[model samples]
Target chain A: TRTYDREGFKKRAACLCFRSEQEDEVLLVSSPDQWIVPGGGMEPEEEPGGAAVREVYEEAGVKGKLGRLLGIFENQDRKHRTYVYVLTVTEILEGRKREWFKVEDAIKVLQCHKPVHAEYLEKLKLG
Target chain B: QTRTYDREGFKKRAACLCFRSEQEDEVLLVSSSQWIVPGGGMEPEEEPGGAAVREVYEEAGVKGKLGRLLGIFENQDRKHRTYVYVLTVTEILEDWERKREWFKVEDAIKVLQCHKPVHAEYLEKLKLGC
Candidate 1:
């Protein structure tokens, strides 16, 4: 372990945000419908909450307030783990630089990705 | 800027259990009294609580309740994070086994001479809390 090779792992902070839980709408980001949520890798020495809030603005063009932690999701194939946080959008600060997709498309994409996202939504009682 | 996925570094979270042997005495340590607390690398296969409980038993030969998280101590240079927890040891099983020992809290802190400055800093915080 002293060689300290690090290529096999990654850490990320991300969240599922909804404008209204009653409406079943989530904040989904895209570039011409790529279908993704807001979040990215942690910066050097960054806390999970800091990463989550920054990614929400960068990817979704929205200001978000940190809620509670949802859980950590592991991608065994990718050899990475995502620290999942809950965020409530306080404002749409600006239009996303990349295209933002609709909630319907987002759900379809979530279904294709894996059960984790869908299960996360279910845990939030959104489904 | 084009997004770059630098997969050259690995990241992990660990759980550390900080237990005080007595209200005014030393914080629990193990691994030949070289480590500040009982802990292990975070395995994605288990919950933090599960990992902490198992590690305490395996490393220190004790069982306890995991209390609130003290804080997350991160080593930026090493690409690792540690979640420190306050564990209250309830039992030291008769059949417990280890190469571990305990020392006074301050003395234990002084003896951890290794590459883990992040952990050393965490132990200092533990000393203050007790």
Candidate 2:
């Protein structure tokens, strides 16, 4: 359950984010109307990476190369804990319907509005 | 309990676990398209070593034998995470449906949308070990 601490409130969670190898696109699924990296709560004994891949399979419907973990967000401000992963799309067969997306048609869905990755932004600009 | 840790941007440790089915004859090492590992948060109260073993059972739906803790690897950008825990799960207890919802490997690949890259890097290692 979520709780408060010296820093703030936080509860452990996991998110699996992947980028397609075909181009520079990312697969995002519409779950309950929110754009979330496919994942959920990190059980007491569960590992973050495992949660990520599981989430993707269950939610996004695509297999991903679980690469080096990206970072840990304590959600220091809000009462939340999230473990993020940088995944790469390897072999997409069926189910991963990026063709369904409407917001951004080119690249990653997570990168839809993110301008923080200067290098990625530059790459997109160049292309 | 202490609930707040630093926002600290994003710092995490993640690993990939691949499993194979005995039903196959040619001996195929499972990859990203197959069932991936189970992972979660690294608790302050839990030991990393213990967490490694625990994760396997929770995510893979198999009781894995963890011989030793492999090397600790960091990403290109030091995403503030460590990885590489070589685990061997020789037997399958037929809990496929329990571990994951039913979907062919091909369909799963398209559905989950991420490649278990580490599997490729260590496929050779697994070939020799298994």
Candidate 3:
């Protein structure tokens, strides 16, 4: 029930917002239905990287360096495709219980029916 | 609790006092938010120059040659360390929802001082080079 790009992939953008440029860890909101990566439906005319940055900002209350699109995942099961990006957390607004998880550990916990969420770490691991 | 510190554990930031022409008599400020100067957080791998140039381009929609390091200013409110650079405008690009305008050095100074005095201080240091 949200916006989708021409391909019928409901457009979604997300960030693997790192605690630092070192990228040893990532921030994930702790909630019952929370997806590990902070993201959701992209708004009208919102480009992926900027929209992903905005998503992390809106969901996590943090902002920092935004990077290029890391990858794209098309999941017909969910009827949406998410563009993952890399961002460094430079400012935090101190809200929303979020936890930082190391790369391997993050991938471990994200293994929970994560679908493409865990795929982000594997790609980052390669880089 | 992993964290990134560009230096001294403070967040690294960069910005510029953009000049309309080579004379340094005018400064460019983004109007969408501020009569404020352009700047943003630096990447962990970015140097002072890269971050400064990137921010002006990203925020102001313009690009130009770099000048001297005006000074690195610290924000008392946030653990932010910012490098303010002097930039002479070479091109006018004109998006991304932010607007820009040119103000005389005097007007620019007055505008910034009313809200962002530290930013006004960037001009104060530039003018003292007189």
Candidate 4:
């Protein structure tokens, strides 16, 4: 017997972060705030990696390929299954809108000031 | 009512770093049996700032002390766009350990690797929190 037998729709996310050619550090952007790499939600019938690529263009105004999928995750708590991938961005178009900042600038923006630079990566996206 | 917030075409990436108030050195990390949204992507309609806040509470068991918006970076190729933010959490739910117990903050930090497998750079940033 199944205490809970139910089917649910699943949602996925594609995150992007890369080691810059100019700088020896990783960066995430296009969504919002600042972190490393950039990605967004997967549309219905769209692959998770594809969705990540779409987000980059829509948000950061860039285009590239969504390389290998690093892993897939599930949140029993959120009931959402997510796809994590390593996105390799290739074409960044000119005439795009963006706000640039140094990694250290994050402290003043979010204003935590304790250790915003510490811990795992922080990827920001806005649409 | 039931409705979600509105956001432009934007996406962001961020990890929720939870630290213990009493222990000072101890941090909270959620270790799931497997990954869920290992690499997360948002929607044009989804708010990056809000999602950052929501995901942490929903994923990690710690809450409070949200921080600023970190810097933004884009891939030269532009296949993806991510936004990263920071939230220094506090006022965690008590009995968290009883259900998800393990005292060592060091161990807690290690547990996050099991959750969806985040990038090392981002993890380092989260640890740096700047």
Which candidate leads in lDDT?
A: 3
> lDDT tens string, model 3, B33-113?
557889888876788899999888888888899999978888878887889998888888634555678888877877888
Model 1, span B1-130: residue lDDT tens: 3111125453445455455543525556665444646676656566666766777777777877778777876667766666677776777766543455555655665676464456656655554321
Using TM-score as the yardstick, the better of models 2 and 3 is 3
**Worst 10 contiguous positions by lDDT, candidate 2 chain A:** A118-127
**Candidate 1 local lDDT, residue B88:** 69
| Local distance difference test scores for all models | 0.62, 0.46, 0.79, 0.46
Model 4, span A26-73: residue lDDT tens: 344423333433444567677666676666676666665566565555
RMSD each, Å: 18.5, 20.3, 18.8, 19.4
Clash number for every model? 0, 33, 0, 84
Tens digit per residue, CA lDDT, model 2, B22-128: 32112213323354435544555655556666655555555655554444444445354444465545645563643344333333333334555443333222322
Clashing pairs in 1: none
The alpha-carbon RMSD over the true interface for every model, in angstroms, is 21.4, 17.7, 23.2, 9.1
When sorted by DockQ, best at the front, the candidate numbers are 4, 2, 1, 3
Q: Candidate 2: which stretches are off by over 4 Å?
A: A1-16, A19-23, A32-34, A91-127, B1-130
For candidate 3, the per-residue lDDT at B91 reads 87
Q: Which is the better candidate, 2 or 3, if ranked by DockQ?
A: 2
Can you write out model 4's per-residue Cα lDDT over B31-118, one digit (the tens) per residue?
A: 4543222224453456666666666665555567766665443433434455556555555565433133333433433454554334
